[PDB]
Amino acid sequence: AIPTNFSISITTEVMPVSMAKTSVDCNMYICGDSTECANLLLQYGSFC
Amino acid sequence: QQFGRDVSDFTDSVRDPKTSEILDISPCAFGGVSVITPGTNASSEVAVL
Amino acid sequence: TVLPPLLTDDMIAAYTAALVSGTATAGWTFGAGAALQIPFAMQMAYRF
Numbered sequence: 001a002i003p004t005n006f007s008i009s010i011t012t013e014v015m016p017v018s019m020a021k022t023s024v025d026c027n028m029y030i031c032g033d034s035t036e037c038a039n040l041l042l043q044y045g046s047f048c
Numbered sequence: 049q050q051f052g053r054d055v056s057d058f059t060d061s062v063r064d065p066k067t068s069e070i071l072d073i074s075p076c077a078f079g080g081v082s083v084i085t086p087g088t089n090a091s092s093e094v095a096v097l
Numbered sequence: 098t099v100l101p102p103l104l105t106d107d108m109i110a111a112y113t114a115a116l117v118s119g120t121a122t123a124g125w126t127f128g129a130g131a132a133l134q135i136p137f138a139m140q141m142a143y144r145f
């Protein structure tokens with residue numbers, strides 16, 4: 001069996017290429033800018 | 049009501065207890081600092097983002 | 098715990114047997130689109 005008539009068709013596909021690039025300031029996250037939090041934070045060094 | 053909360057539970061809206069004037073709270077200002085340099089071989093002048 | 102997969106073993110068998118029978122009676126046409134009836138030595142002649 002050999003094809004005689006035919007068709008064409010467009011299909012779509014979708015795939016991401018990037019991401020929502022973020023950033024987290026530590027002071028306004030782990031502290032909330034209390035003076036107490038920044039001074040126990042030195043006991044963890046430059047972990048942030 | 050006396051105080052509003054945001055979509056996360058931090059108080060961003062204060063009604064004044066004295067004048068019943070309702071006010072938003074913004075953060076103070078925070079962000080990041082970046083530095084622009086052409087290279088220490090090239091100059092000694094910087095731009096700051 | 099462990100959960101059994103959806104696509105079971107006999108399904109995993111029966112999708113695999115149709116990869117063989119259709120390759121054995123339609124060959125290139127089995128994957129190229131609508132599978133087409135054809136002798137197997139003709140399929141080899143197509144491949145070779």
Ligand SMILES: *[C@@H]1O[C@H](CO)[C@@H](O)[C@H](O)[C@H]1NC(C)=O
Pocket residue numbers: 089090
């Ligand atoms: C870069 O520095 C070297 C010495 O460290 C100097 O010889 C050279 O002239 C400098 N480049 C330019 C463009 O001045």
